[PDB]
Scaffold this motif. Sequence first.
Motif, PDB file in Angstrom:
ATOM      1  N   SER A   3      61.929  87.776 -47.628  1.00 24.21           N
ATOM      2  CA  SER A   3      60.582  87.782 -47.440  1.00 24.21           C
ATOM      3  C   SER A   3      59.851  87.314 -46.054  1.00 24.21           C
ATOM      4  O   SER A   3      59.042  88.094 -45.596  1.00 24.21           O
ATOM      5  CB  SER A   3      59.499  87.283 -48.754  1.00 24.21           C
ATOM      6  OG  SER A   3      60.207  87.543 -50.004  1.00 24.21           O
ATOM      7  N   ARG A 158      63.969  83.185 -55.371  1.00 26.71           N
ATOM      8  CA  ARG A 158      63.692  84.152 -55.972  1.00 26.71           C
ATOM      9  C   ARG A 158      64.510  84.220 -57.533  1.00 26.71           C
ATOM     10  O   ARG A 158      64.434  85.377 -58.324  1.00 26.71           O
ATOM     11  CB  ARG A 158      64.555  85.392 -55.448  1.00 26.71           C
ATOM     12  CG  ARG A 158      63.448  85.966 -54.201  1.00 26.71           C
ATOM     13  CD  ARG A 158      64.022  87.065 -53.571  1.00 26.71           C
ATOM     14  NE  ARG A 158      63.468  87.446 -52.168  1.00 26.71           N
ATOM     15  CZ  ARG A 158      63.088  88.775 -51.908  1.00 26.71           C
ATOM     16  NH1 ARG A 158      63.761  89.641 -52.703  1.00 26.71           N
ATOM     17  NH2 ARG A 158      62.466  89.077 -50.767  1.00 26.71           N
ATOM     18  N   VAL A 212      57.328  92.173 -55.571  1.00 26.94           N
ATOM     19  CA  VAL A 212      56.651  91.169 -54.559  1.00 26.94           C
ATOM     20  C   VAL A 212      57.559  89.596 -54.930  1.00 26.94           C
ATOM     21  O   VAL A 212      57.163  89.090 -55.978  1.00 26.94           O
ATOM     22  CB  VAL A 212      55.434  91.145 -54.053  1.00 26.94           C
ATOM     23  CG1 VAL A 212      54.731  92.316 -54.115  1.00 26.94           C
ATOM     24  CG2 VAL A 212      54.510  89.947 -54.855  1.00 26.94           C
ATOM     25  N   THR A 214      57.371  85.600 -53.495  1.00 26.62           N
ATOM     26  CA  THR A 214      56.624  84.999 -52.372  1.00 26.62           C
ATOM     27  C   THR A 214      56.758  83.353 -52.840  1.00 26.62           C
ATOM     28  O   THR A 214      57.590  82.923 -53.840  1.00 26.62           O
ATOM     29  CB  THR A 214      54.953  85.068 -52.708  1.00 26.62           C
ATOM     30  OG1 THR A 214      54.741  84.850 -53.854  1.00 26.62           O
ATOM     31  CG2 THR A 214      54.380  86.397 -51.913  1.00 26.62           C
TER      32      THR A 214
END
Length: 298
Positions: A3, A158, A212, A214
């Motif tokens: 990311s 993640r 997504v 983050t």
Amino acid sequence: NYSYIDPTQLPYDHKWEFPRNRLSFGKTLGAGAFGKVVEATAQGLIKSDAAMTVAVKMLKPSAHSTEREALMSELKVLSYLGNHENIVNLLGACTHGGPTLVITEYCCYGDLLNFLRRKRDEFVPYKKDFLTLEHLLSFSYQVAKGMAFLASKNCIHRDLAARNILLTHGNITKICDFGLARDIKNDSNYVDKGNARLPVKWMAPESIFNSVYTFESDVWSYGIFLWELFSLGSSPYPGMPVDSKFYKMIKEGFRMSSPEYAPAEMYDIMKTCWDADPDKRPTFKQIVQDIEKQISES
Ligand SMILES: COc1cc(Oc2ncnc3cc(OC)c(OC)cc23)ccc1CC(=O)Nc1cnn(C(C)C)c1
């Protein structure tokens, strides 16, 4: 695949380079479809003539170009992060003369999930090697510390979960990432979702529904890890299969109730980690400060 940072742009310090002929491989600690972690003896890694036990991550001949690029990116990220007490430490690598070997420190007690499951019956909430609430609060603090470090380095895990935490000497937990060295096809904690096999029960809604990842989605998974920790290795959302009803319930605001051994103030952390709005979630730094206060009060 990353990311914020781009690992392909990260350098590789040849200070890490170790000759592979000085490695003696032992048992496979873990293996997936494309990768594996093997116990090894590294001769001449210590300044004296002494040998040392290390863990070595490598790809299997089943691996393609994608896994090859991924293992190299992992090595660059580990080299970039440097040594941190709460992160598995890189000791060396073998990039020349064959397949990529990522060499790390060996963690005595394996993954935290299996350790908690082995210690479930030898657990004392009150303050042989009995596991206590003091140990669980310390593990929660160490994981939040390691994650606060990772976010400061613009790294997103993640896949934060007790299965990706190693336990070593002096009750020191280390964040790792088995990645390709985990058999995710046979692991019921990774669900088939589209083309992928994903750890949905640890994933933030925005990761599930919008792909997504983050800093805030890692915080969500930390909340789930807290739940696993204070339930002593129990699977999250127990008795609930990952289906349409699960995705609906998560989007509608259903959240797990407190696990059996969680202090109220840890459950308070979990609730805020699970805010639907990522902006209302605490940072790992805020979590560290919160646990620090809980430890001092204790
Ligand atoms: C060699 O590399 C690894 C070795 C691993 O396994 C073990 N390592 C040490 N001791 C073990 C002892 C065991 O039982 C006694 C064991 O029983 C299953 C596995 C052990 C796990 C992961 C990796 C790679 C890795 O963490 N990469 C990475 C990528 N990003 N990050 C960020 C920092 C979060 C970390």
